[PDB]
């Protein structure tokens, strides 16, 4: 199991523009197109992303390309975030994956806000931090995913993903 496999399980794969749980236009493997209501806006954003006239549909290949990019940007964002980088570096590899997952899903920003947990996470207080992260809109909104991610973070194993 690795980060790609993990997020691929958590975000799925859709070839046609769809709305996420939040109702935002998205495509591929969790590739948010836009926050705007405009499906037109969304095709435009899509076209620009792919470099062609998609007409709201991409191939698998295209989807995996956005995904590679998105994973990559997620990692690089972490590493340029001053709050984040140090937690990251302190982590073992499974746990690092958990952090990247959250960052991909919520942004450096949304993640920036788990300060209380993350501190505990920097401290190796697996249980404490896990319980605190649970007190989050994040968890209440996508409890099953949230659960898998928090378990991975806490245990440092992929059990949740088997
Ligand atoms: Cl893009
Ligand atoms: Cl979920
Ligand atoms: Kr955390
Ligand atoms: Kr955690
Ligand atoms: Kr966490």
From Swiss-Prot:
| Enzyme's top EC category | hydrolase
Known outcome of mutating residue 30 to F? Almost complete loss of enzymatic activity. The enzyme is destabilized by 1.5 kcal/mol
List GO terms (cellular component aspect): host cell cytoplasm
Q: Mutating residue 132 to M/F: effect? A: 2-fold decrease in enzymatic activity
Q: One Pfam family for this entry, by name?
A: Phage_lysozyme
For binding substrate, which residues are annotated in this chain's numbering?
32, 104, 117, 132
> What keywords are annotated for this sequence in UniProt?
Antimicrobial, Bacteriolytic enzyme, Cytolysis, Glycosidase, Host cell lysis by virus, Host cytoplasm, Hydrolase, Viral release from host cell
Function according to Swiss-Prot or TrEMBL: Endolysin with lysozyme activity that degrades host peptidoglycans and participates with the holin and spanin proteins in the sequential events which lead to the programmed host cell lysis releasing the mature viral particles. Once the holin has permeabilized the host cell membrane, the endolysin can reach the periplasm and break down the peptidoglycan layer.
Q: What is this protein called?
A: Endolysin
* Effect upon mutating residue 117 to F: 10-fold decrease in enzymatic activity
